[PDB]
Amino acid sequence: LERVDPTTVRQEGPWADPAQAVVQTGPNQYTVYVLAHQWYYQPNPIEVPQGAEIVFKITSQDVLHGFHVEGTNINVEVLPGEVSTVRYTFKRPGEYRIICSEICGANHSNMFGTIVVKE
Numbered sequence: 001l002e003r004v005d006p007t008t009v010r011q012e013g014p015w016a017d018p019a020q021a022v023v024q025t026g027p028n029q030y031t032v033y034v035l036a037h038q039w040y041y042q043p044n045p046i047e048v049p050q051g052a053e054i055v056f057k058i059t060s061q062d063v064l065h066g067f068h069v070e071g072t073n074i075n076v077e078v079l080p081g082e083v084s085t086v087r088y089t090f091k092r093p094g095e096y097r098i099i100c101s102e103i104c105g106a107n108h109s110n111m112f113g114t115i116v117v118k119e
C-alpha cells in the first residue's frame, strides 16, 4: 500500500507541480501523476502517446474520488493519503473522458477530465 501525506501533496512530491505530471520512464513507458480535487482533475488534459504503456499514479488532496476512463477497464477509487496505480495502453488516438465514479459533493456530476492520446 503506497501512502502519501494528503495535506502536503500540492507542496512537495510528484503531484506538486502540475506541469510535471507526465514523466517518461521507458522508451514507450510513461507515468502520469493525477491529483483529484473537489471538483477537478490535475492535470487536464492528460496527454500521452498511442501504444505506450501508461502508469497512472492517482491520489486525492481532499476527499474520496473516482477515476474511470470511459471505453477502458480503468475504474479505481481515489483515497486521500493513498496512491492508486492503474496500468493501461491506449490502442486508439483521440480523446477519452475521465469521470468521477465516487460521489464527492456538490460538483460531482460535472467532475470530468480529458485524456488526449496522440498518434
Ligand code: CUA
Residues within 6 Å of the ligand: 036, 037, 039, 064, 065, 066, 100, 101, 102, 103, 104, 105, 107, 108, 109, 111
Ligand atoms: Cu470526485 Cu465525485
